[PDB]
């Protein structure tokens, strides 16, 4: 497994994922990672992107997801199904995902992570997602639709 749930009192508050050799989790997700190998890692507070990160242990280096900045318009996959990306916006049908789903990765047709979900906005029949993505030059950026609620 490359995604690990985060639980504070036994309930799932969010998910953590291993991308590019680093462990990622949102700042607003409280609790401990079920994997003690990751929970024991001291995480840096990147308040610029609302993400905690650390170095993957050598024993966990094999459980790493590849990522890419090449994200053309189309459909992407995640734990709740397909995700539609257009006009520099990530969108899912309304009711697909909610509180507790922050930190899930979005994968392309080759299994490469293109984004990490932080929250979203319900826009009628569709819900827009707040995600952390890499721009056309591969630089990490945070995309936040107005009024997005952290999940």
């Amino acid at each position: 497994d490359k995604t690990f749930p985060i639980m504070l009192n036994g309930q799932v508050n969010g998910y953590a994922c291993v991308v590019g050799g680093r462990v990622f989790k949102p700042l607003h997700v409280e609790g401990r990672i079920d994997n003690e190998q990751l929970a024991a890692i001291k995480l840096k507070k990147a308040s610029i992107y609302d993400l905690e990160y650390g170095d993957v242990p050598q024993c966990m280096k094999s459980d790493t997801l590849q990522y890419t900045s090449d994200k053309p318009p189309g459909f992407y996959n995640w734990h709740h199904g397909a995700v539609q990306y257009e006009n520099n916006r990530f969108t899912v049908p309304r009711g697909v995902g909610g509180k507790g789903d922050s930190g899930r990765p979005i994968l392309d047709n080759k299994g490469r992570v293109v984004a990490i979900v932080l929250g979203g906005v319900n826009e009628g029949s569709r819900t827009a997602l707040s995600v952390v993505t890499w721009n056309q030059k591969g630089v990490t950026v945070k995309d936040t639709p107005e009024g997005s609620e952290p999940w």
Partner: protein
């Protein structure tokens, strides 16, 4: 005394030099920090746009 002493009467040229260096150096260092913070904020803005 036939003269009147003032607050700055005793401050020599070297004393003024050191005062100017300390005040200017600390002020310039503060300005450097503030400028770097603003510049990096613009760099991040261009990263998103």
């Amino acid at each position: 005394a036939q003269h009147t002493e003032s607050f700055t009467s005793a401050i020599s040229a070297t004393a003024w030099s050191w005062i100017k260096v300390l005040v200017g150096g600390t002020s310039a260092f503060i300005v450097l920090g503030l400028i770097a913070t603003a510049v990096v904020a613009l760099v991040l803005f261009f990263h998103r746009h």
